[PDB]
Amino acid sequence: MAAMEANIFCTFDHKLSIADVGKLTKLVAAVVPIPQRLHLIKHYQLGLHQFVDHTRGYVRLRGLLRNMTLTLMRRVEGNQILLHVPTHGLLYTVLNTGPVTWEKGDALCVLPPLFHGPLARENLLTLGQWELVLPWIVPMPLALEINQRLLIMGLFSLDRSYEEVKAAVQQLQTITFRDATFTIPDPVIDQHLLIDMKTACLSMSMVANLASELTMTYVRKLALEDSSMLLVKCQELLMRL
């Protein structure tokens, strides 16, 4: 066949205001995925919007976003966009779409956006009932704790009264990474979390049947002999003795 293309041209169909083509000129070198990967793509397949559904689930997005072909936008103009498919190991600039500030040397991750809450960006590039959603690029630690929060929401959801789950989800969704707050957009328990519940409980239970007699006992051995701040809270999570 024709091999996978490095340069991909995107064409909009809806009439582009002189105001809005200027948003894409400021949107250059952004991380925009496509599922298709042909040479002359439609605008419909740009970005994450096509995967919005009535389910309104965040994990569906986290899961479908993993399969999409990440592309870096390039050489925007009237009538044309030129997405580039990056090659592994080669350098690229990356525009900072999200509010999160990027430390030097930090690794980055791609997760669907987490709206601030009270405020939203105006320059959505909505047109024809087609909004331009793009995935957030976040530092690795924030992308870790967003998933840890989501999984804890999924594990706590079962075996708990539905009113208790409201109180937990009301706080598990807000994240104060790097002094900014963020909120997961409609995190919902689903089948997509259910299979991960099964794999997490299975791996975490097979962990319990692999630690040696001394490996579990090390904390007891440590606290009975030496104490520090780290050990105080670990004495707490150990429930009783």
């Binding site: 024709a2 091999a3 293309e5 490095a6 340069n7 040479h39």
Partner: protein, 49 residues
């Protein structure tokens, strides 16, 4: 015969010829010169125009 009745619907596809009509200078079609992008697949070079 049970109490209810059925009202099956059924779509049917017909292959067909179609006659378009369009007036003189109904549309202008502005064009530019075609451009030739090139890639190298170690084994071959595909170009697109």
């Amino acid at each position: 015969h049970p109490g209810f009745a059925l009202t099956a619907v059924r779509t049917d596809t017909f292959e067909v010829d179609m006659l378009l009509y369009s007036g003189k200078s109904c549309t202008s079609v502005i064009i530019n010169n075609p451009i030739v992008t090139k890639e190298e697949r170690d084994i071959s070079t595909t170009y697109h125009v």
